[model samples]
Target: DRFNGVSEAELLTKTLPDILTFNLDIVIIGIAPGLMAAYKGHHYPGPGNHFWKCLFMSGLSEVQLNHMDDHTLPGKYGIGFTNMVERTTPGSKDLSSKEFREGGRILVQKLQKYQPRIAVFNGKCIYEIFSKEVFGVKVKNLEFGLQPHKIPDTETLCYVMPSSSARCAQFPRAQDKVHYYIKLKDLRDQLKGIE
Candidate 1:
């Protein structure tokens, strides 16, 4: 009754679960779940979003992933997914600064436990907040790609990429973001060889 025709149970299921694995090569982290993703119980469900498209185009994925195949990623690609914040919001602007910082702490703990070889931040905002809060490092001016500094307290290499959200105006086309993902895949392959 509160949310038009949608039930409270339906709204409660909007929180997306982390697509994680114990043996992971790269962990892709997002800011949070958007309205469409939350509703669909998937990551990057919005039609305009290019996350899955970039993954396939960059050679990271053999096939394009749809919302239905979200759970198959880790088993198939050694790539896991998680979010900086767990909350579902209409947009990133709906979250508070406090939420970001708190989420950063939680994420750092998760990384320390899982110890993935590489942690890729899908946007600069979450990475900047997490770096500042956990390591006292301000990555405000950090460039997009493999970060020179590793995540403090863990050997995990950190990388940043343009957001795949359709709202992201900086890299409007999927092809633009595909370049970064390809670099990430190349780095992952190199690191995989050494490991």
Candidate 2:
């Protein structure tokens, strides 16, 4: 019950107040919000978490925005946010492969329905988990930025951004987290026809 059996528990949690509910030019999906994010009803609420800081490093935005204003994302920058699971637990490790499988299906459905130009997953955990469930392949050590595959023929670009969590236990600092964010922004610019 502690580890979710090589995964996390089934997240039956509801959407937070800050949960995004609109079509976006870019959809940034992560494993899930951390405890602070869950409680604050905001993504990357933890201080020095680097989620937004990386947004700055990405060089895609003229101005940086906070996760607290995530609801205004689409209008402001054509970017939006979501999670693999809607539930908010102590950590991302609480997410299970089942959650990823079912959640990925639902996520893809939304992506199709929303028709976003791109869906950038913010961590390797997502690609690996969903790939196994959807394609029966276990992707190892995937990196950030554009992927070669298409998403169900929609021409949706699938990217894997870095996990900005201090607890990620993978990367060292903001440098590591910001690398993908900058790349994501660059990719966004490429999609937007930005020169």
Predicted model with the maximum TM-score: 1
The models' CA-based lDDT, in order, is: 0.84, 0.70
Indicate the worst ten consecutive residues by lDDT in candidate 2.
3-12
Write down the TM-score for model 1: 0.91
**lDDT digits (tens) for residues 142-168 of candidate 2:** 656777666785777788766777666
Model 1 CA lDDT for position 158: 93
Among the numbered candidates, top lDDT falls to 1
Q: Please estimate how well model 2 matches the true structure, expressed as its whole-model Cα lDDT.
A: 0.70
lDDT of 1: 0.84
> What would the TM-scores of all predictions be?
0.91, 0.81
